[PDB]
């Protein structure tokens, strides 16, 4: 703690990465095979040395060694976009509310504006004015629709500037639990209405239904003869369940998101949007995976043999297909047989990256994708973030003793020569730190290593009684750097009779099961040793129980 941190983090903003990974990372990847002969990683494949140093090389980007490079990202150029298997639940619904002929939603452009203009209000801290927009409802001319929504949108411009002049909201908006309640109710009802409808109702020009499967194929249903008659008398004045190529959905959706920018401006934004970053189609398709750094993807071992990495096996099949969806492109470029494998390639390349992320959406036990290492008590988010393992801790069998204080814990000398604590030297504690450093890490009131001003450590384990005494007299010698006039020498002393330590029975239900004690080092013993009267608070009986002593 001699190195204070300045800036801090206050608030994490989520968001979807764009197609501008190209600006940050120029380390695109083509080669699927990485471990070549003579034990080297290939330059350009998945184990490139521009993705951090790997096996005692230099990073081609950092230029640092194995352990000083943070690591680097890289992008894999897919030939076409492929829709993201997280967001398929919110594009299939937006595909079913769609029409390819009017390129609006199936609901009317006064019904759609009615829900959106409520959601402008509910990104401010006001709910009373949200149910006042339904107080304005007055073979319908274009004079009732140039003038109704002219009054609704007028009222919201009145209401916000009322509230913003008041303290009922800020520029950055108000967002509380009940406002969040009143926001999800509309959207779950907004996605109730638009999903089911008969026709597009700007017109008679409507589109036929759609149909999915297990996140792989999208099937545009054909038309019944009930409706061939409709589009030919209104739009002018093969079989069902056809496969649709994925890049035509991108022509459907992006012509929607620029027609209906404004309603979907408020669906995808719950704070008031300041910088008006527009809702686009890269929020749902993926032109590029990112490639995590090499440090985050390392092999494991069984017996003596270091075996195959699990990430790259998922990321090989995506990249071997990337050549074979590209090698097969030249044959169709040379002018059947070859359509049936190119279209088989597009089905599997979505099912490639679907295998990459969510293993429950692809073909004894398969490989865990990146979601699968995150969702249980086991996995990451509940185990290595809520449940971090610690330094400076011990556990043992406990034992009773009446002859000590009730607020103490009797500690073996094995534990008293291990757990250190940084004691900064000053003008008053130099005398109990000389006798620390004179003893060293075998005589109990001693020290294991001392920290200099610069940040370097000086061990004390290997030395003898003279060199320690040489160095135990140099503690309050200031050093001639300009940066380190303040940072005094932290001696790491052994734990003593005056430090405080925590105790922790493992089923820790109530807060008295993890209390704080003072430390009394007892020689000639082997176990932690506790008073009887502090078995009421743990309900631990002294016949085979373990207590994690954190420090």
């Amino acid at each position: 703690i001699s190195k204070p941190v300045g800036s801090e983090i206050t608030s994490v903003d989520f968001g979807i990465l764009t197609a501008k990974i190209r600006n940050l990372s120029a380390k695109q990847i083509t080669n699927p095979t990485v471990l070549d002969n003579l034990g080297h990683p290939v330059s350009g494949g998945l184990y490139d040395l521009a993705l951090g140093a790997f096996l005692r090389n230099l990073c081609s980007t950092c230029g640092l060694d194995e352990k000083f490079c943070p690591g680097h990202q890289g992008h894999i150029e897919l030939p076409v976009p492929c829709y993201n298997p997280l967001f398929f639940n919110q594009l299939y619904i937006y595909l079913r509310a769609s029409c390819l002929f009017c390129h609006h939603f199936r609901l009317k452009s006064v019904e759609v504006h009615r829900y959106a203009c409520k959601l402008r209000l509910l990104q401010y801290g006001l709910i009373d004015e949200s149910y006042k927009l339904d107080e304005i409802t007055l073979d319908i001319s274009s004079t009732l629709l140039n003038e109704l929504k002219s009054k609704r949108s007028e009222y919201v411009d009145m209401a916000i500037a009322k509230a913003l002049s008041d303290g009922r909201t800020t520029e950055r908006g108000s967002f509380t639990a009940t406002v969040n309640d009143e926001r999800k109710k509309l959207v779950h009802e907004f996605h109730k209405k638009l999903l089911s409808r008969g026709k597009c109702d700007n017109c008679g020009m409507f589109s036929p239904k759609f149909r999915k499967d297990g996140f792989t194929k999208i099937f545009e249903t054909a038309l019944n003869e009930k409706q061939i008659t409709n589009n030919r008398v209104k739009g002018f004045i093969k079989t069902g369940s056809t496969y649709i190529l994925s890049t035509e959905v991108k022509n459907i959706l992006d012509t929607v998101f620029r027609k209906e920018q404004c309603v979907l401006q408020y669906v995808f934004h719950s704070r008031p949007n300041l910088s008006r970053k527009l809702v686009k189609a890269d929020s749902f398709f993926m032109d590029v995976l990112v490639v995590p750094p090499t440090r985050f993807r390392l092999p494991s071992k069984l017996g003596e043999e270091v075996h195959e990495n699990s990430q790259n096996q998922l990321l090989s099949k995506v990249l071997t297909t990337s050549l074979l969806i590209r090698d097969l492109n030249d044959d169709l470029s040379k002018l059947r047989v070859i359509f049936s494998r190119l279209m088989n390639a597009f089905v599997t390349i979505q099912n490639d990256v679907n295998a990459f992320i969510d293993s429950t959406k692809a073909q004894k036990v398969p490989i865990p994708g990146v979601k699968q290492a995150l969702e249980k008590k086991e996995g990451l988010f509940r185990k290595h973030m809520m449940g971090k393992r610690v330094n400076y801790a011990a556990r043992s069998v406990i034992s009773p003793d009446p002859n000590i204080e009730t607020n103490e814990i009797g500690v073996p000398p094995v534990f008293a020569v291990k757990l250190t604590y940084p004691e900064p030297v000053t003008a008053y504690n130099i005398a109990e730190l000389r006798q620390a450093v004179i003893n060293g890490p075998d005589k109990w009131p001693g020290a294991t290593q001392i920290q200099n001003e610069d940040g370097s450590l000086v061990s004390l384990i290997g030395m003898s009684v003279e060199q320690r005494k040489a160095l135990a007299n140099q503690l309050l010698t200031p050093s001639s750097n300009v940066s380190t006039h303040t940072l005094n020498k932290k001696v790491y002393r052994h734990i003593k009779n005056r430090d405080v330590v925590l105790m922790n029975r493992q089923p820790t239900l109530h807060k008295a099961s993890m209390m704080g004690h003072k430390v009394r080092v007892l020689p000639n013993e082997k176990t932690l040793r506790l008073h009887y009267a502090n078995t009421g608070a743990y309900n631990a009986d002294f016949d085979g129980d373990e207590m994690n002593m954190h420090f």
Binding site: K377, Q506, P507, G544, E546
Partner: peptide
């Protein structure tokens, strides 16, 4: 039973083994 549970506190159940999980799955 309090040996391997004393090597790691994992005294839960994998399945729910309860009637309340029917609408939960």
């Amino acid at each position: 039973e309090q040996s391997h549970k004393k090597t790691k506190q994992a005294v839960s159940y994998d399945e729910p083994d309860e009637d309340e999980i029917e609408t939960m799955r």
